Design an enzyme around this catalytic site. Sequence first.
Site, PDB file in Angstrom:
ATOM      1  N   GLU A 228       0.847  -1.182   0.000  1.00 18.97           N
ATOM      2  CA  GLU A 228       0.000   0.000   0.000  1.00 18.97           C
ATOM      3  C   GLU A 228       0.888   1.240   0.000  1.00 18.97           C
ATOM      4  OE1 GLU A 228      -3.027   0.381   3.109  1.00 18.97           O
ATOM      5  OE2 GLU A 228      -2.861   2.570   3.064  1.00 18.97           O
TER       6      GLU A 228
ATOM      7  N   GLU B 156      -2.878  11.843   2.645  1.00 20.25           N
ATOM      8  CA  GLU B 156      -3.881  11.779   3.697  1.00 20.25           C
ATOM      9  C   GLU B 156      -3.846  13.082   4.492  1.00 20.25           C
ATOM     10  OE1 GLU B 156      -4.421   7.778   5.530  1.00 20.25           O
ATOM     11  OE2 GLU B 156      -2.233   7.684   5.264  1.00 20.25           O
TER      12      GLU B 156
END
Length: 254
Positions: free
Chosen positions: A115, A120
């Site tokens: 990942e 974010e």
Amino acid sequence: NVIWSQEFDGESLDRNVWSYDVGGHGFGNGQLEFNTDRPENAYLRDGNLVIEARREAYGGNAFTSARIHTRGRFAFQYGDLEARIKVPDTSDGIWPAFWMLGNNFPGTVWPKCGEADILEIGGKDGIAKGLQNRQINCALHFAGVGEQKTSLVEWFDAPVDLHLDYHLYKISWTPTHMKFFLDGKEFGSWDITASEMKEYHQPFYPILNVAVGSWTHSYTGLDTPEKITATLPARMYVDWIRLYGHPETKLVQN
Ligand SMILES: [Ca+2]
Ligand SMILES: [Ca+2]
């Protein structure tokens, strides 16, 4: 050298590229929003993808949003993937993300699939320090030495309020590194040559979502609807996502 893109020019999201993750089960982070496949949460308008989080009773949850990905339709290995995004005001609760998973997910379980989080925003630390509109991170999540969950995270206090305008959020991904950028400037970098990071030399597919809340021990620190103070509806605007090809790029469009 753009070799793939979604410009989000139409009237509706292209289901021959995009799929919806539907559910309000928390997505392994104690998230509050029910991600739906309805037009109210993901729609195209004025040359933009809009993902809209709402305070709204639905499916047993107190919020709706959307979580979309191109798995099965678009994946790539190596290249620069960049998106022009205007994020909403996160003001305690909202957790938008632009990220990628290995193309062998979900057959290969997380995090052995690998990942990479490109953007974010809306973290608890950002809340504690009054930097809600500025503090971001990139991240690698994978199976490290001994095949156990490992997390590398790099935080960055952005100079300007990011929800005020569109900015460019990019990964540069080569056989030796993964690098992350805000408006052309690098704020994160990791070497990916080590033996335990072979998961990062396979195709990956992009994901876009706007989450609401998390467990207290998870990203936002805010685990109930009543603790969510953010302005709703909250809209994330995506003007485009573009893949700039490298010599070594492999395209997966099956
Ligand atoms: Ca556009
Ligand atoms: Ca590994």
